[PDB]
Scaffold this motif. Structure first.
Motif, PDB file in Angstrom:
ATOM      1  N   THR A   1       9.817  13.958  -0.024  1.00  0.00           N
ATOM      2  CA  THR A   1      10.819  12.908  -0.119  1.00  0.00           C
ATOM      3  C   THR A   1      10.172  11.535   0.017  1.00  0.00           C
ATOM      4  OG1 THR A   1      12.846  12.009   0.883  1.00  0.00           O
ATOM      5  CG2 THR A   1      11.275  13.115   2.340  1.00  0.00           C
ATOM      6  N   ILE A   2      10.759  10.558  -0.671  1.00  0.00           N
ATOM      7  CA  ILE A   2      10.389   9.153  -0.552  1.00  0.00           C
ATOM      8  C   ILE A   2      11.625   8.387  -0.106  1.00  0.00           C
ATOM      9  CG2 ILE A   2       9.531   7.097  -1.733  1.00  0.00           C
ATOM     10  CD1 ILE A   2       8.253   9.108  -3.784  1.00  0.00           C
ATOM     11  N   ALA A   3      11.440   7.420   0.789  1.00  0.00           N
ATOM     12  CA  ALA A   3      12.568   6.625   1.247  1.00  0.00           C
ATOM     13  C   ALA A   3      12.099   5.253   1.702  1.00  0.00           C
ATOM     14  CB  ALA A   3      13.318   7.315   2.390  1.00  0.00           C
TER      15      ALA A   3
ATOM     16  N   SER B   1       0.825  -1.203   0.000  1.00  0.00           N
ATOM     17  CA  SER B   1       0.000   0.000   0.000  1.00  0.00           C
ATOM     18  C   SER B   1       0.862   1.257   0.000  1.00  0.00           C
ATOM     19  CB  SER B   1      -0.944  -0.011   1.203  1.00  0.00           C
ATOM     20  OG  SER B   1      -0.228   0.020   2.425  1.00  0.00           O
ATOM     21  N   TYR B   2       1.919   1.276   0.812  1.00  0.00           N
ATOM     22  CA  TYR B   2       2.831   2.414   0.808  1.00  0.00           C
ATOM     23  C   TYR B   2       3.563   2.523  -0.522  1.00  0.00           C
ATOM     24  CZ  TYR B   2       2.288   3.511   5.759  1.00  0.00           C
ATOM     25  OH  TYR B   2       1.792   3.903   6.978  1.00  0.00           O
ATOM     26  N   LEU B   3       3.966   1.387  -1.092  1.00  0.00           N
ATOM     27  CA  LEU B   3       4.657   1.410  -2.375  1.00  0.00           C
ATOM     28  C   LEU B   3       3.761   1.973  -3.470  1.00  0.00           C
ATOM     29  CD1 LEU B   3       6.943   0.835  -4.255  1.00  0.00           C
ATOM     30  CD2 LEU B   3       6.298  -1.579  -4.280  1.00  0.00           C
ATOM     31  N   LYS B   4       2.491   1.566  -3.491  1.00  0.00           N
ATOM     32  CA  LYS B   4       1.572   2.097  -4.491  1.00  0.00           C
ATOM     33  C   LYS B   4       1.381   3.595  -4.314  1.00  0.00           C
ATOM     34  CE  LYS B   4      -1.305  -1.832  -5.836  1.00  0.00           C
ATOM     35  NZ  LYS B   4      -0.680  -2.948  -5.085  1.00  0.00           N
ATOM     36  N   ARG B   5       1.240   4.052  -3.070  1.00  0.00           N
ATOM     37  CA  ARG B   5       1.092   5.481  -2.822  1.00  0.00           C
ATOM     38  C   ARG B   5       2.338   6.239  -3.264  1.00  0.00           C
ATOM     39  NH1 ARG B   5      -1.362   4.749   1.264  1.00  0.00           N
ATOM     40  NH2 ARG B   5       0.077   5.103   3.005  1.00  0.00           N
ATOM     41  N   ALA B   6       3.518   5.740  -2.892  1.00  0.00           N
ATOM     42  CA  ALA B   6       4.758   6.389  -3.306  1.00  0.00           C
ATOM     43  C   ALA B   6       4.896   6.397  -4.823  1.00  0.00           C
ATOM     44  CB  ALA B   6       5.956   5.691  -2.663  1.00  0.00           C
ATOM     45  N   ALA B   7       4.528   5.294  -5.476  1.00  0.00           N
ATOM     46  CA  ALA B   7       4.641   5.222  -6.928  1.00  0.00           C
ATOM     47  C   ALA B   7       3.757   6.262  -7.605  1.00  0.00           C
ATOM     48  CB  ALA B   7       4.278   3.819  -7.411  1.00  0.00           C
ATOM     49  N   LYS B   8       2.526   6.431  -7.120  1.00  0.00           N
ATOM     50  CA  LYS B   8       1.642   7.432  -7.703  1.00  0.00           C
ATOM     51  C   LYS B   8       2.225   8.833  -7.580  1.00  0.00           C
ATOM     52  CE  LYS B   8      -2.204   7.487 -10.003  1.00  0.00           C
ATOM     53  NZ  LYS B   8      -2.346   6.686 -11.251  1.00  0.00           N
TER      54      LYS B   8
ATOM     55  N   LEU C   1      10.796  11.087   9.274  1.00  0.00           N
ATOM     56  CA  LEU C   1      11.716  11.974   8.572  1.00  0.00           C
ATOM     57  C   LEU C   1      11.429  12.091   7.082  1.00  0.00           C
ATOM     58  CD1 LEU C   1      15.155  11.239  10.248  1.00  0.00           C
ATOM     59  CD2 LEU C   1      14.103  13.473   9.988  1.00  0.00           C
ATOM     60  N   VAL C   2      10.482  11.326   6.545  1.00  0.00           N
ATOM     61  CA  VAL C   2      10.176  11.365   5.122  1.00  0.00           C
ATOM     62  C   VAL C   2       8.678  11.539   4.929  1.00  0.00           C
ATOM     63  CG1 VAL C   2      12.186   9.978   4.535  1.00  0.00           C
ATOM     64  CG2 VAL C   2       9.981   8.851   4.911  1.00  0.00           C
ATOM     65  N   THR C   3       8.312  12.155   3.803  1.00  0.00           N
ATOM     66  CA  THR C   3       6.904  12.385   3.499  1.00  0.00           C
ATOM     67  C   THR C   3       6.183  11.074   3.207  1.00  0.00           C
ATOM     68  OG1 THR C   3       7.642  14.464   2.504  1.00  0.00           O
ATOM     69  CG2 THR C   3       5.347  13.826   2.154  1.00  0.00           C
ATOM     70  N   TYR C   4       6.767  10.236   2.353  1.00  0.00           N
ATOM     71  CA  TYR C   4       6.152   8.984   1.913  1.00  0.00           C
ATOM     72  C   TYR C   4       7.123   7.844   2.185  1.00  0.00           C
ATOM     73  CZ  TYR C   4       3.009  12.143  -0.583  1.00  0.00           C
ATOM     74  OH  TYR C   4       2.117  13.137  -0.908  1.00  0.00           O
ATOM     75  N   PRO C   5       7.014   7.188   3.335  1.00  0.00           N
ATOM     76  CA  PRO C   5       7.888   6.049   3.617  1.00  0.00           C
ATOM     77  C   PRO C   5       7.425   4.781   2.917  1.00  0.00           C
ATOM     78  CG  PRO C   5       6.389   6.323   5.424  1.00  0.00           C
ATOM     79  CD  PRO C   5       6.083   7.439   4.451  1.00  0.00           C
TER      80      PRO C   5
ATOM     81  N   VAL D   1      14.175  10.907  -3.796  1.00  0.00           N
ATOM     82  CA  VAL D   1      14.042   9.495  -3.457  1.00  0.00           C
ATOM     83  C   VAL D   1      15.353   9.041  -2.832  1.00  0.00           C
ATOM     84  CG1 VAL D   1      13.598   7.171  -4.324  1.00  0.00           C
ATOM     85  CG2 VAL D   1      12.372   9.120  -5.293  1.00  0.00           C
ATOM     86  N   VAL D   2      15.270   8.456  -1.640  1.00  0.00           N
ATOM     87  CA  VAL D   2      16.441   8.072  -0.860  1.00  0.00           C
ATOM     88  C   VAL D   2      16.380   6.571  -0.623  1.00  0.00           C
ATOM     89  CG1 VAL D   2      17.778   8.477   1.233  1.00  0.00           C
ATOM     90  CG2 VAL D   2      16.437  10.339   0.232  1.00  0.00           C
ATOM     91  N   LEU D   3      17.372   5.849  -1.145  1.00  0.00           N
ATOM     92  CA  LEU D   3      17.406   4.400  -0.974  1.00  0.00           C
ATOM     93  C   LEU D   3      17.838   4.016   0.437  1.00  0.00           C
ATOM     94  CD1 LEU D   3      18.961   3.319  -4.385  1.00  0.00           C
ATOM     95  CD2 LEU D   3      16.569   3.714  -3.783  1.00  0.00           C
ATOM     96  N   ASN D   4      18.817   4.730   0.997  1.00  0.00           N
ATOM     97  CA  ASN D   4      19.393   4.425   2.306  1.00  0.00           C
ATOM     98  C   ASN D   4      19.286   5.663   3.192  1.00  0.00           C
ATOM     99  OD1 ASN D   4      21.221   5.620   0.497  1.00  0.00           O
ATOM    100  ND2 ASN D   4      22.989   4.959   1.708  1.00  0.00           N
TER     101      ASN D   4
END
Ligand SMILES: [Mg+2]
Lengths: 257, 231, 60, 55, 342, 36, 61
Positions: free
Chosen positions: E291-293, E176-183, E303-307, E270-273
């Protein structure tokens, strides 16, 4: 998982077999059944191991030098060889299923007939076919493979293998049957091959061989018995060599363009 | 239709965007042509690698931001692409590598092959301390003249005479040449060694294959030591 | 006839190893080779002329 | 004079080939079956006596 | 059939080598041997009408293409291969090309491979966000959190349980978070925003570069310079900017020095680490950059908008999640370029 | 037609010309000295 | 400026502006062509040195 490749014009192959060589039942045994039998066994042998992600040709090369992986090598060699045989005896490599093409007249190319004369002391293709039929009958007592191969020196020569013997890697050609008696000349060839394999410095004890097949004929009982019967394998090899698909065989000879 | 301002390079936000973009371009070539075999004459150490200097690459690779390790990384990829087999290379690789080849073609060298003169004589000059020597070497039977005088007359010290003979002793040609040495300035030691240096430089014309042996013996090196005003 | 007698001599030397493509094929192959040797001479002269002038008028 | 005839046939054929395109030394004088002539020696070969002494 | 054509050239090529070899032979001979004898012959010879034809035809032919000419101006695959003679064995280069021919046709005969994971396909063939399943996420190892000893209890709501001394992340929430971040990535891409992909762990560069390429974005794989966003004029002012149209094609208009010094702030980071990029996250907050992380069990979600809850230590898990976000951006980019056409 | 630059102006851009010595009768020696 | 003069000569040589004399003399050609686009209006003021004050220290004692 290793799956059986889809063949062009498969509906025709399952109805009228391969004209002039195999019938519908004969082709179901050699390809639709045996190829399924081999691929399933290969998957069971290689699933869960690194070899699962490699094509059969690469597997045989990787395992050619490992004595205890011969079972995997045999399966990989048979699968690759069987699709080399089924490919050059196939009516048409292109899929004329919707084009309903019934005119495929393929003849030896000029490069092929030039290399035949050069490597066979001027012998014609017809004479070479007779030598191939003779070699199969006298050198392969049981199962095996008949190949017309090309080496690094541009010379075409005839190689016969016993059971599942790869043409690519001379240490595993399995061209001498040691169950029966061998002449001093054959023992010298084996002794010389052993010396070459011992000169390699690699920890895997592997050598470089650049031989490549041009024509493949399946000499296993799965290909001829049902249609020809015990003892009639020379009539089967004659038909195969007379009805080869030369669009595939010509493409196997390196031109350099 | 609507227009906006965007960073030019995909690596804009990196430390050195210019270097990273160039490395990416070379990396793409090394990936697209991973299969192409490399030269087996690389074992023979082919002597071709005229790459631009670190300072020249700093003009195009970030200037001050450019770090030595970044320049080393550029050379490892330029050489790898360059060492692809010449027969199997393509235009793309050569075009990318062309921009990194040093250019010094507009100017030429100032060295002309030395040759024997009209009388078969090799003339060389040598210097040691304040002394200078101009020698005339010709093929002969080992006759030497120093300022028109016999060697034993001009040079009383046997060690000075041995120094003059050393270059001829290295090429084992002591009895194969006649030397007419003229020297001025300094003292006996400076003049004897200035002649030694000049004979070694004049012997290279007779057989340029012996230069390496003369250099290894140390007779083709000009001694720089001179009297230093105490500081 | 040096202009022509030197080129005939060149083919005479090649005739030694030869011991009629040489009528038109070799004859052409020779003229072209000479043109490439006479163009390299002119290229070398240009470098000398450019190195004997002040290519660097303002600084160097 | 076949010598002057074949030489004069070789000189005029060359003129036409060079006329076909702009005459540039590197390209127009390219070796047989070659793209151009990269304009890239005084490396005297040692004599037999010079090489014997070095050996 | 047409080999003779090549044979005709080779014949000339051999003849050319012969002409050159004996041109160098005459370059050694002293002039005293040839010149005087040559001149004497002419002194003993008389030019004929034909001889004179070449006396001036060659003078012009040599005064036109050697002296009065411009010394300079102001089979496609493997075109530098030197084929070997038909009698000689194959060269090393030809054997390589002969093997490449075999590799294309024969090397893959016998069987096809199904249901086998290939690492490269994660980067080049990422799935669409709607086709992602829990199994797919689990196959990539996204559920494998940190040791229970390193737990940051602020992630408690993302944890599915503990197993083998590690916390298992709940993939139902990750999806669910991944779909939200992807959008969000798709929206920003379709709007023309700048998307920066930040990841500084070893091995992430390949994924980061491809993600930026397919979204027309940017990436940083080496080091985040502290101050890149808050001190952008002292770090990024010198680098070049460009103007682009709605099709992302350079307009080529020269930019005034005023326009080339203005801060160019990313629209999405977008932050991987994130655990190793606190500086970047704090700068994004200060700069109001969404930010997405990927948030592992030991990472701070707030610390991020969309974890995106998930394993950040495995390259497979990271490259799987990065690929999905990159393809989402690609679809947004393609939809923006499509609306411009029609 | 471009502006003609006569030989007198051109000479200024090249090394000074010297006249050949016919007899070799030295008539004067001019020695110049400077601290630079 | 240095690349403008080299181009001027390269062009004046490639255009040919006694073969024996083509190995001794170095006269490239007309002064105008060699110095094309190099005039008093663009060369002098661009090469002048010490033209900008960039530092100054004043001490008292
Ligand atoms: Mg972690």
């Amino acid at each position: 998982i290793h799956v059986v490749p889809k063949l062009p014009n498969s509906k025709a192959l399952l109805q009228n077999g391969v004209p002039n060589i195999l019938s519908s039942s004969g082709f179901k045994t050699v390809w639709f059944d045996y190829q399924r039998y081999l691929c399933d066994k290969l998957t069971l042998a290689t699933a869960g191991q690194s070899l699962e992600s490699y094509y059969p040709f690469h597997i045989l090369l990787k395992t050619a030098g490992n004595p205890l992986q011969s079972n995997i090598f045999n399966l990989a060699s048979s699968i690759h060889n069987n699709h080399l045989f089924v490919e050059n005896i196939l009516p048409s490599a292109v899929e004329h299923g919707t084009n309903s093409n019934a005119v495929v007249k393929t003849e030896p190319s000029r490069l092929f007939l030039s290399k035949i004369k050069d490597s066979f002391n001027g012998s014609d293709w017809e004479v070479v076919k007779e030598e191939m039929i003779y070699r199969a009958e006298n050198e392969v007592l049981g199962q095996g493979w008949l190949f017309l191969v090309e080496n690094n020196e541009k010379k075409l020569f005839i190689l016969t293998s016993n059971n599942n013997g790869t043409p690519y890697y001379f240490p595993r050609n399995q061209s001498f049957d040691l169950n029966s008696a061998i002449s001093i000349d054959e023992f010298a060839t084996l002794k010389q091959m052993k010396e070459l394999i011992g000169k390699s410095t690699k920890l895997n004890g592997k050598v470089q061989d650049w031989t490549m097949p041009i024509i493949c004929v399946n000499l296993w009982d799965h290909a001829y018995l049902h249609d020809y019967g015990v003892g009639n394998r020379s009539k089967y090899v004659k038909n195969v060599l007379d009805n080869l698909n030369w669009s595939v065989v010509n493409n196997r000879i390196f031109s350099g363009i | 239709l609507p227009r906006r301002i965007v960073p030019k390079l995909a690596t804009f936000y990196s430390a050195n965007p210019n270097h990273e973009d160039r490395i990416n371009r070379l990396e793409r070539l090394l990936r697209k042509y991973i299969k192409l075999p490399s030269q087996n004459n690389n074992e023979a150490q082919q002597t071709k690698a005229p790459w631009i200097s670190f300072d020249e690459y700093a003009l195009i690779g970030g200037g001050t931001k450019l770090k030595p390790t970044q320049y080393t990384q550029l050379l490892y990829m330029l050489n790898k692409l360059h060492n692809i087999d010449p027969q199997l290379t393509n235009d793309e690789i050569t075009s990318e590598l062309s921009q990194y080849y040093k250019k010094s073609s507009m100017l030429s060298n100032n060295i002309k092959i030395k040759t024997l003169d009209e009388f078969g004589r090799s003339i060389a000059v040598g210097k040691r301390k304040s002394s200078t020597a101009k020698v005339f070497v010709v093929r002969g039977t080992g006759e030497i003249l120093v300022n028109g005088r016999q060697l034993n007359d001009y040079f009383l010290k046997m060690k000075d005479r041995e120094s003059i003979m050393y270059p001829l002793q290295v090429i084992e040609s002591v009895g194969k040449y006649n030397i007419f040495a003229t020297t001025s300035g300094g003292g006996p030691t400076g003049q004897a060694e200035s002649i030694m240096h000049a004979i070694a430089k004049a012997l290279v014309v007779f057989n340029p294959l012996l230069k390496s042996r003369l250099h290894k013996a140390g007779v083709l090196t000009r001694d720089y030591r001179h009297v230093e005003r105490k500081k | 006839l040096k202009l022509l007698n030197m080129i005939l001599s060149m083919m005479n030397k090649t005739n030694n190893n030869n011991n009629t493509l040489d009528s038109l094929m070799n004859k052409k192959l020779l003229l072209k080779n000479m043109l490439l040797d006479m163009n390299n001479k002119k290229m070398n002269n240009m470098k000398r002329m450019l190195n004997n002038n002040n290519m660097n008028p303002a600084g160097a | 004079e076949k010598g002057v005839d074949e030489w004069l046939e070789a000189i005029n054929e060359l003129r036409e080939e060079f006329s076909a395109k702009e005459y540039l030394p590197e390209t127009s004088l390219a070796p047989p079956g070659q793209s151009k002539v990269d304009l890239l020696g005084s490396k005297i070969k040692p004599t037999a006596e010079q090489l014997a002494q070095w050996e | 059939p047409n080999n003779n054509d090549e044979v005709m050239l080779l014949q000339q090529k051999l003849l050319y080598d012969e002409i050159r070899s004996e041109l160098k032979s005459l370059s050694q001979v002293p002039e005293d041997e040839i010149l005087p004898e040559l001149k004497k012959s002419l002194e003993q010879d008389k030019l004929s009408d034909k001889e004179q034809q070449l006396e001036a035809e060659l003078s012009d032919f040599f005064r036109n293409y050697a002296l009065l000419n411009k010394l300079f101006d102001s089979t496609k695959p493997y075109p530098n291969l030197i084929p070997s003679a038909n009698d000689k064995p194959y060269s090393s280069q030809e054997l390589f090309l002969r093997q490449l021919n075999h590799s294309m046709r024969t090397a893959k005969l016998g069987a096809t491979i199904s249901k086998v994971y290939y690492p490269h396909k994660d980067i080049f063939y990422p799935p669409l966000p709607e086709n992602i399943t829990v199994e797919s996420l689990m196959s990539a190892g996204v559920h494998l959190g940190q040791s229970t000893s390193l737990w940051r209890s602020s992630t408690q709501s993302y944890i599915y349980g503990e197993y083998k001394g590690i916390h298992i992340i709940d993939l139902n929430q990750t999806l669910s978070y991944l779909k939200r971040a992807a959008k969000v990535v798709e929206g920003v891409s379709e709007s023309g925003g700048i998307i920066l992909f930040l990841g500084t762990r070893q091995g992430q560069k390949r994924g980061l570069e491809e993600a930026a390429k397919k979204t027309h974005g940017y990436y940083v794989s080496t080091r985040w310079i502290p101050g890149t966003l808050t001190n952008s004029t002292e770090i990024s002012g010198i680098w070049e900017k460009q103007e682009i149209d709605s099709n992302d094609n350079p307009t080529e208009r020269a930019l005034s020095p005023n326009e080339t010094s203005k801060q160019v702030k990313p629209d999405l980071l977008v932050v991987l680490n994130p655990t190793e990029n606190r500086n970047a996250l704090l700068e994004a907050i200060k700069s109001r950059v969404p930010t997405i992380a990927i948030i592992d069990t030991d990472s701070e979600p707030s610390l991020v908008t969309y974890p995106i809850p998930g394993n950040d230590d495995s390259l497979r898990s990271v490259n799987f999640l990065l690929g999905v976000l990159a393809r989402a951006g690609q679809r947004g980019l393609q939809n923006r370029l499509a609306r411009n056409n029609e | 037609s471009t502006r003609p630059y006569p030989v007198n102006v051109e000479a200024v851009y090249y090394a000074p010309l010297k006249l050949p010595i016919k007899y070799g009768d030295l008539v004067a020696d001019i020695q110049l000295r400077s601290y630079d | 400026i240095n690349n403008n003069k080299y181009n001027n000569m390269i062009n004046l040589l490639n255009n040919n502006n006694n073969n024996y004399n083509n190995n001794n003399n170095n006269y490239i050609g007309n002064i105008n062509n060699i110095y094309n686009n190099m005039t008093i209006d663009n060369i002098p003021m661009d090469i002048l040195m010490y033209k900008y004050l960039v530092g100054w220290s004043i001490k008292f004692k």
